[PDB]
A paper describes a structure:
The outer membrane is a formidable barrier that protects Gram-negative bacteria against environmental threats. Its integrity requires the correct folding and insertion of outer membrane proteins (OMPs) by the membrane-embedded β-barrel assembly machinery (BAM). BamA is composed of a 16-stranded β-barrel, which, in E. coli, is preceded N-terminally by five polypeptide transport associated (POTRA) domains that extend into the periplasm. Unfolded OMPs are delivered to BAM by the periplasmic chaperone SurA, but how SurA and BAM work together to ensure successful OMP delivery and folding remains unclear. The results suggest that SurA binds BAM at its soluble POTRA-1 domain, which may trigger conformational changes in both BAM and SurA that enable transfer of the unfolded OMP to the BAM lateral gate for insertion into the outer membrane.
Therefore, we created a chimeric SurA-OMP construct by concatenating the mature sequence of OmpX directly to the C-terminus of SurA. This increases the local concentration of the OMP, and prevents it from complete folding, effectively trapping the OMP on the BAM-SurA complex. A cryoEM dataset was collected, which contained a BAM: SurA-OmpX complex in a single conformation, with BAM in its Lateral Open conformation and SurA in its Extended state. Additional density was present adjacent to the Core domain of SurA in the BAM: SurA-OmpX complex, consistent with a short region of the unfolded OmpX polypeptide binding at this site, although the resolution in this region of the map was not sufficient to sequence the bound peptide or determine its directionality. No additional density was observed at β1 of BAM, indicating that the OMP is not yet stably engaged at the site of membrane insertion. We term this structure the ‘Arrival Complex’, as it shows a substrate OMP bound to SurA on BAM, presumably in the initial stages of its journey to the OM, and before its β-signal engages with BamA-β1. In this structure SurA is once again in the Extended conformation, as observed in the Arrival Complex, but the chaperone is not as well resolved, presumably since it is not stabilised by a disulphide bond in this complex. This structure together with the Arrival Complex suggests that SurA binds POTRA-1 first prior to the OMP β-signal engagement with BamA β1. The binding of an unfolded OMP to SurA does not seem to generate novel conformations of BAM, as exemplified by the Arrival complex wherein the Extended SurA conformation predominates and BAM is in a Lateral Open state.
Residue numbers in the entry:
A (entry chain B): 24 to 392
B (entry chain X): 1 to 8
C (entry chain E): 25 to 113
D (entry chain F): 25 to 164, 393 to 427
E (entry chain C): 25 to 85
F (entry chain D): 26 to 243
G (entry chain A): 24 to 806
């Protein structure tokens, strides 16, 4: 009670606005993530916005209006309470006429979109806490048990259950797999990233990047919990405690590494990569050799979100609801916008020349100049 | 490596 | 009478069937395995082991059963006394 | 005049020890040329190499691992066969070279023990997936590609484990 | 009342311990042996001519 | 608590205060001396007068701990027997520490743990240094500790005798005969054989004890 | 070359010759010029030195050594979760302490240990740093800085993998509190792996006792939020299915006692397999075997299960052993109490086969003496022959003497006070002595009491008491309230069984009283006595000599003798007169305090105190007035006053009674004395019934070290006092107190503390329901 002496600092950066943004609309789906950290993020598909909350309600929305299309709740009527929350946590993913929503209750649902019902419901081995990614008639979900499950896109049919290793202090938010040329690039909670083929479930090659040579190994978590990205034949990886690394996809060979690491989510332009440090420090690196292009260490421990490039500008929010427009070159506070007071922990997404963000309670906030 | 004679 | 008397036990309680197996010549170690260490033995010269089976429940006549083992100065039993006690009073 | 170079947990490295590798190497030891950036600039790397050596010796002592004399005999015979030079004549040569026979025995013993310790504790942290072997064989075979795989994986794992010990060990320079 | 006499170089306790009775062993009986020769608290014999009681001028020398 | 000074004046005033007898303060300055100067030239004398002040000030646990610490540091020294003699004295003073003196109560049947510890210490003394100047007092204190142990054991045996636990009495008094064959308490415990064996009907063993009682009756 | 002598620079720890012990040169051997390194390594390998230096600047070898600096003081700050003591013994665990050396690696080891402990509690973003501050003359000092950021908070617990039990029901069961109710401060949301293990074992038991046998915990994860704030605990469970106990078979080296073993084993077929049931059966078997002399049995229950028909065939493994006998009995800690006063309270007799329940019955019995802080059993065996055991009790002595003192009044009365002492274990001999006396210008009273619990060593007790109360109104013996009385009482008691003991005795007391204030009750008593004194004047003097017989009964089972936590007690006493006595009457007193524990730790206890007292006369001769009951104040209903609850005396119209100086003794004197004058003086009747209830909770601001010395009470108390004798005609103008329907109640808190001067009680009373003449007091102090 009297021990609250949190060693931290979150001073406000200078307010600097060279253009004014606007909120096109908001919907206020209701109490969603709340205090709970998870991987919720609204998804869009061809002028149709899909959003959901922890209460089980999933809502299809249109752009430029915010008008409801159809919204159903995922209350467990078959359950003992017949209305108890499903605690939806998987990332919102769209695939044709199918929308995939994961949950922490070892359940993933195949929403059927226009009709409003669910195509099928399957109980998965362990909780599903990563965004479901479809891959050539199959979807992969990173269960928080060291298990990756291959679910048939048409219906159920968990094909292979690969086994990983979980050190018993793994942090939440396990990395999501990436599909490319039959190769899955997925990281585990043990700081080792491996590839598996999406037709039978064979482990191709395993390589370890996280080097936490600290005093206390238990507090040295050093797990890779970010979505990898691939450009041409080289993939990118990040551990919690450092080890930015670019490495060969065909082999277990690392061209080079940047020990700065300490990033949980990042983006790539194809020529300049961007990332967010554990210390909320933005920095650009050269894809050729990891040379520090530039940095802006103005922010420090403000509980930021994922970096997103939009219209030649970098955008990122904070728990305070502030919105930051950061200059593409050398960084600069182009504009600041207190868009909400509920809180932000989800990843922004920009698609179809638009920009999408969700707050803890205000839910969707359409972003436009 | 500098020295020639080393551990076998 | 009128006062409460707790039960008094002052000696290891013996089972006659175990005593039945006892015979002359049966030596100290096997005695220990069969019955156990005698609580009170004779330390004055001869090494004779005493096993007293005595109970005083209270407000009732004491019950007693005296078992005597006589050993030579080598470790082998010589004689047994299965005296039923209850002498006189 | 022999001071103590530094401290390593429960052991120390002393000045004559680095002497046995500064004036006994780099225009000594073998192939006198080697490398000449500068000896003063090289003082740092020789110290770090020797402190790593001492750390591995302490480790090998902690697992209670020892080497008997017969292994040393085979090792010195192998040194003789690769050097294409007879053992007793090498003893006579090192008599004037500045390398005592007993110091030679000690240094060969510790080199063998450090090599075997690092091998034994690295091949546990090296894994082989029976999938990449086929692809690498198709790149160019029959357990031959596994040799290159082993060499490369050892190449990274050695430095990884060395820095692991270095960060997690008590070290401090004295002179 | 008052503390120990001069409160220097004396035992903190009393002195009446000197009134212990003398020691005389119990002789063996006639034609039979005792097991008493099995103890461990044996007192070595020593001479006198030593400070006793208040004569013990205990000081750190 | 005292100003920092060289060893001379501080040691001199501490020793003078010790001669004064004000132990409660003298120990404070002396402890400051020891703490400031851990292994100075005269460390052993510092430990010695620490023990002196502690014992004179009734500091039994601290004094015992300091004794046990010291007896390792200086295994051979002209005062080791003196040091562990004071240790045994502290043990006995711990044993006989109560208000029985004002009321005159024969402390004979309390916990003999401290009596046993002092007995062991003084036996080690008389075995190690029988030629010292403390041997007579050590022997007298061993006599007293023997008497106290014998009296305690005889008290326990007597209690059990009127309780009625005959065989327990027999085993106990056999133990005292085995270990305390010289004391006078056993001489008063001899009839307990007659009390027990006759009550448990082993007169055949009772005649021998009656004979030995008559022999030593004198 | 050849060295002549060796000199050093280290003299603080190493002896002058101890360093010479490790010299291989022996001061008389030529230097090979390579053995120097070997010698240096040998010297440092001792772990005794830091610096080793050799110099031959002359013709001799000089040794320069830097020994470990001596730690002289430890200082540390930033500590909130860890106080001084546990830190001190944690440092001692490594052997690093003031007065000895300082090795640097142990410091880092300590940092790792404290960091691990912080992670254990939840202090994740917290770091320990040791600041080694140098000191002159080869010394150092240590400073510890704790950057205690914030404890970890738990947000969610998941039990995914279940199909038979609701999440909320389970998450209520774990010791961990995932979510505290908003309008409750009952607990917090801390973390502890010890509590995690406890709750997973509790979950295991909760499935295994519901009938599910094929159950196990698959795995468990502890997610950590990427800010070092939140911990999510998730478990993995294989639900399995229920099962039925088909039958249980006993196996192993069981003795002839197998009949009652099977009787215990008697189980209705088809019962659900329960882990708690199996554990209870094993414990019962173990205690049954210990009851017969086998104190070390070997028990294992095998859940032999068919995985096809919902059946289990439990198998009991028994390896009894031998008959274990007690060799001797030893007690430790009875530094002042006589060894006898502990032996006679044993129940497991020395010199027989061990009693598994006799030993613990004796252990609780010694605790029930009431003058022992903690008593603990300890079973240990001889290192020689197999089947022996030594029983040792480590008791600790607590004060058993209560000191009571008071003063006459604030005005300088002079040499007026009350002094005394009550002792239960006087000199540790076991005799109970109670002496106390008072002197005052209004009163002087002193009494003495002696009690022997074991006059004989069987249970028979003896007790006696004396008193003397001739104060004769020390202010003035003329025309004042005079009372002279004294007597002797001797009693004895013996037990009936383990829990019941009655008492009996005899005695005689006479009372002489003169110049009594005129009031209806005592006049009625005198008229019953056959005497008809006057009314207006107060000068009558009467002497009554009473010979009477006492008796009492007592049942007492109680875990502790000083504010216990479990059990109850009754204290009856019957008082009956005998022929030839001046007064013929009978009096009885019922007292009963009841305890009940609500928690396993037995810290929250509801105390039930009830006391009923009734008395009446025999042959038409009523109770003497001085034997009336009272109430109020301490040991009774608390909050109004002592000896003031009950009927109030009323005087006749009173005037010209002997000597009545003005402004004083104005009970009912007045020129205009019209009729009966109401007064607040309460004497009470002969029928009393008081009930009291209180809650017992530990003090919320005390440490465990003195948590046994302080007691907190939430008391609720009611009191009833009335007279069975009444006359409506005389009591026409006054309320009919003979009806016991008038009850007074008060409530509040009271703080109880044990002190070397005796038991200390302070009360904060708040009366709620009151009557006439209560003069309620919110505060009382007593001993």
């Amino acid at each position: 009670n009297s021990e609250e002496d949190v060693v931290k600092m979150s001073p406000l950066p200078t307010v600097e606005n060279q253009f004014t943004p606007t909120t096109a609309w908001s919907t206020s789906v209701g109490s969603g993530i709340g205090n709970f950290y998870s991987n919720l993020h609204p998804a869009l598909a061809d002028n149709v916005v899909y959003a959901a909350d922890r209460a089980g309600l999933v809502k299809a929305l249109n752009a430029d209006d915010g008008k409801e299309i159809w919204s159903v709740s995922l209350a467990e009527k078959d359950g003992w309470f017949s209305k108890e929350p499903a605690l939806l946590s998987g990332g919102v993913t769209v695939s044709g006429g199918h929308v995939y929503i994961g949950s922490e209750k070892a359940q993933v649902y195949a929403l059927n979109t226009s009709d409003g019902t669910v195509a099928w419901q399957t109980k998965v081995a362990g909780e599903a806490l990563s965004r479901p990614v479809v891959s050539d008639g199959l979807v992969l979900i990173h269960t928080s048990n060291g298990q990756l499950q291959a679910l048939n896109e048409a219906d159920g049919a968990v094909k292979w259950t690969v086994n990983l290793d979980m050190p018993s202090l793994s942090l939440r938010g396990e990395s999501a797999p990436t599909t490319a040329f039959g190769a899955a690039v997925v990281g585990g909670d043990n700081g080792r990233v491996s590839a598996v083929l999406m037709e039978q479930g064979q482990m191709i090659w395993q390589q370890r990047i996280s080097q936490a040579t600290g005093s206390t190994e238990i507090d040295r978590l050093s797990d890779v919990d970010t979505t990898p990205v691939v450009v041409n034949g080289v993939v990118f990886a990040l551990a919690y405690n450092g080890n930015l690394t670019a490495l060969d996809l065909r082999s277990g060979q690392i061209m080079w590494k940047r020990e700065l690491g300490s990033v949980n989510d990042f983006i790539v332009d194809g020529n300049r990569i961007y990332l967010v440090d554990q210390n909320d420090r933005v920095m650009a690196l050269t894809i050729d050799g990891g040379v520090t292009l530039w940095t802006q260490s103005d922010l420090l421990h403000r509980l930021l979100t994922s970096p997103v490039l939009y219209n030649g500008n970098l955008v990122v929010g904070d728990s305070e609801g502030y919105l930051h427009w950061i200059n593409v070159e050398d960084g600069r506070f182009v504009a600041q916008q207190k868009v909400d007071s509920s809180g932000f922990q989800t990843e922004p997404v920009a698609a179809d020349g638009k920009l999408l963000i969700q707050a803890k309670d205000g839910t969707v906030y359409s972003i436009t100049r | 490596d500098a020295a020639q004679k080393d551990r076998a | 009478r009128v006062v409460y008397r707790p039960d008094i036990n002052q000696g290891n309680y013996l089972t006659a069937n175990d005593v039945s197996k006892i015979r002359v010549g049966m030596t100290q170690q096997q005695v220990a395995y069969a019955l156990g260490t005698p609580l009170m033995s004779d330390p004055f010269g001869t090494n004779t082991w005493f096993y007293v089976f005595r109970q005083q429940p209270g407000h009732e006549g004491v019950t007693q059963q005296t078992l005597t083992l006589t050993f030579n100065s080598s470790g082998v039993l010589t004689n047994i006394d299965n005296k039923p006690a209850l002498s006189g009073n | 005049v022999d001071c103590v170079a530094a401290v390593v947990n429960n052991g120390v490295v002393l000045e004559s020890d680095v002497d046995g590798l500064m004036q006994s190497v780099k225009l000594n030891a073998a192939q006198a040329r080697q490398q000449l950036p500068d000896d003063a600039t090289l003082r740092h790397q020789i110290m770090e190499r020797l402190i790593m050596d001492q750390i591995i010796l302490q480790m090998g002592q902690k697992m209670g691992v020892k080497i008997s004399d017969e292994q040393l005999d085979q090792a010195i015979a192998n040194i003789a066969k690769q050097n294409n030079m007879t053992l007793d004549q090498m003893r006579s040569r090192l008599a004037y070279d500045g390398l005592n026979y007993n110091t030679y025995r000690n240094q060969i013993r510790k080199e063998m023990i450090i090599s075997e310790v690092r091998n034994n504790e690295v091949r546990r942290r090296i894994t082989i997936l029976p999938q990449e072997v086929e692809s690498l064989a198709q790149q160019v075979q029959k357990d031959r590609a596994y040799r290159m795989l082993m060499n490369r994986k050892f190449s990274e794992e050695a430095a990884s484990w060395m820095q692991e010990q270095r960060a997690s060990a008590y070290v401090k320079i004295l002179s | 009342c008052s503390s120990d006499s001069r409160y220097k170089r004396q035992v903190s306790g009393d002195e009446a311990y000197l009134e212990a009775a003398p020691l005389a062993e119990l002789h063996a009986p006639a034609g039979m042996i005792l097991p008493v020769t099995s103890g461990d608290y044996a007192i070595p014999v020593t001479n006198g001519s030593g400070a006793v009681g208040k004569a013990l001028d205990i000081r750190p020398p | 608590e005292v100003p920092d000074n060289p060893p001379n004046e501080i040691y001199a005033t501490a020793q003078q205060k010790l001669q004064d007898g004000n132990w409660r303060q003298a120990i404070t300055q002396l402890e400051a001396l020891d703490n400031r100067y851990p292994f100075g030239p005269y460390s052993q004398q510092v430990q010695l007068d620490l023990i002196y002040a502690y014992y004179k000030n009734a500091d039994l646990p601290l004094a015992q701990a300091a004794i046990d610490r010291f007896i390792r540091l200086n295994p051979t020294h002209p005062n080791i027997d003196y040091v562990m003699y004071m240790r045994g004295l502290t043990n006995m003073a711990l044993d006989d520490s109560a208000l029985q003196g004002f009321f005159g109560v024969d402390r004979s049947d309390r916990d003999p743990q401290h009596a046993r510890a002092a007995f062991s210490d003084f036996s080690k003394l008389v075995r190690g240094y029988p030629n010292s100047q403390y041997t007579t007092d050590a022997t007298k204190r061993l006599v007293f500790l023997k008497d106290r142990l014998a009296k305690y054991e005889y008290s326990v045996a007597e209690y059990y005798t009127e309780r009625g636990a005959w065989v327990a009495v027999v085993n106990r008094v056999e133990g005292m005969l085995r270990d305390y064959p010289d004391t006078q308490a056993t001489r008063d415990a001899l009839p307990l054989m007659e009390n027990a064996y006759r009550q448990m009907q082993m007169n055949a063993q009772a005649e021998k004890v009656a004979k030995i009682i008559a022999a030593n009756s004198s | 070359f050849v060295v002549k002598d060796i000199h050093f620079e280290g003299l603080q720890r190493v002896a002058v010759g101890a360093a010479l012990l490790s010299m291989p040169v022996r001061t008389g051997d030529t230097v090979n010029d390579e053995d120097i390194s070997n010698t240096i390594r040998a010297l440092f390998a001792t772990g005794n030195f830091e610096d080793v230096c050799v110099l031959r600047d002359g013709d001799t070898l000089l040794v320069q050594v830097k020994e470990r600096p001596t730690i002289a003081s430890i200082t540390f700050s930033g500590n909130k979760s860890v106080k001084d003591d546990m830190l001190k013994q944690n440092l001692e665990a490594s052997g690093v302490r003031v007065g000895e050396s300082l090795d640097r690696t142990t410091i880092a080891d300590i940092e790792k240990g404290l960091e691990d402990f912080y992670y254990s509690v939840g202090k994740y973003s917290a770091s320990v740093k040791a600041v080694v501050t140098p000191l002159p003359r080869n010394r150092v000092d240590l400073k510890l800085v704790f950057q205690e950021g914030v404890s970890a908070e738990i947000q969610q617990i998941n039990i995914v993998g279940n199909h038979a039990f609701t999440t909320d029901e389970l998450i209520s069961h774990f010791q961990l509190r995932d979510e505290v109710p908003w309008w409750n401060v009952v607990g917090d949301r801390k973390y502890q792996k010890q509590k995690l293990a406890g709750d997973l074992e509790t979950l295991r038991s909760y499935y295994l006792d519901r009938g599910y046998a094929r159950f196990n915990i698959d795995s468990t994860q502890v997610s950590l939020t990427p800010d070092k704030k939140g911990i999510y605990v998730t478990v993995n469970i294989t639900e399995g299915d229920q099962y039925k106990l088909s039958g249980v078979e006993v196996s192993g080296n069981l003795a002839g006692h197998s009949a009652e073993i099977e009787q215990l084993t008697k189980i209705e077929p088809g019962e659900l397999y329960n882990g708690t049931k199996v554990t209870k059966m094993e414990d019962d078997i173990k205690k049954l075997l210990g009851r017969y002399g086998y104190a070390y049995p070997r028990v294992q229950s095998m859940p032999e299960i068919n995985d096809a028909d919902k059946t289990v065939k439990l198998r009991v493994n028994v390896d009894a052993g031998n008959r274990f006998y007690v060799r001797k009995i030893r007690f430790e800690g009875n530094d002042t109490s006589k060894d006898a006063v502990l032996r006679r309270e044993m129940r497991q007799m020395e010199g027989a086969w061990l009693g598994s329940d006799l030993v613990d019955q004796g252990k609780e019995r010694l605790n029930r003496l009431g003058f022992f802080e903690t008593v603990d059993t300890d079973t240990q065996r001889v290192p020689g022959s197999p089947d022996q055991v030594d029983v040792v009790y480590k008791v600790k002595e607590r004060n058993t003497g209560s000191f009571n003192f008071g003063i006459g009044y604030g005005t300088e009365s002079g040499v007026s006070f009350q002094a005394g002492v009550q002792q239960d274990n006087w000199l540790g001999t076991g005799y109970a002595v109670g002496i106390n006396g008072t002197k005052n210008d209004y009163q002087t009273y002193a009494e003495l009491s002696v009690t022997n619990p074991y006059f004989t060593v069987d249970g028979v007790s003896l007790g006696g008491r004396l008193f003397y109360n001739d104060f004769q109104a020390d202010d003035a013996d003329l025309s004042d309230y005079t009372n002279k009385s004294y007597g002797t009482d001797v009693t004895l008691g013996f037990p009936i069984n383990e829990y019941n003991s009655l008492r009996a005795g005899l005695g005689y007391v006479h009372n002489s009283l003169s110049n009594m204030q005129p009031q209806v009750a005592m006049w009625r008593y005198l008229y019953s006595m056959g005497e008809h004194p006057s009314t207006s004047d107060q000068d009558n003097s009467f002497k009554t000599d009473d010979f009477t017989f006492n008796y009492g009964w007592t049942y007492n089972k109680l875990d502790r003798g000083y504010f216990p936590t479990d059990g109850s007690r009754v204290n009856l006493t019957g008082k009956v007169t005998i022929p030839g006595s001046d007064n013929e009457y009978y009096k009885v007193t019922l007292d009963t305090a009841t305890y009940v524990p609500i928690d396993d730790d037995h810290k929250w206890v509801v105390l039930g105190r009830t006391r009923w007292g009734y008395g009446d006369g025999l042959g038409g001769k009523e109770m003497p007035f001085y034997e009336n009951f009272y109430a109020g104040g301490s040991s009774t209903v608390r909050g109004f006053q002592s000896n003031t609850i009950g009927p109030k005396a009323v005087y006749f119209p009173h005037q010209a009674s002997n000597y009545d100086p003005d402004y004083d003794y104005e009970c009912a004197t007045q020129d205009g004395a019209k009729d009966l004058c109401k007064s607040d003086d309460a004497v009470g009747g002969n029928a009393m019934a008081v009930a009291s209830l209180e809650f017992i909770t530990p003090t919320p601001f005390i440490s465990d070290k003195y948590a046994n010395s302080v007691r907190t009470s939430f008391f609720w108390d009611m009191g009833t006092v009335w007279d069975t004798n009444w006359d409506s005609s005389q009591y026409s103008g006054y309320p009919d107190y003979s009806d016991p329907s008038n009850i007074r109640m008060s409530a509040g808190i009271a703080l109880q503390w044990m002190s070397p001067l005796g038991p200390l009680v302070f009360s904060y009373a708040q009366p709620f329901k009151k009557y006439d003449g209560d003069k309620a007091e919110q505060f009382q102090f007593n001993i």
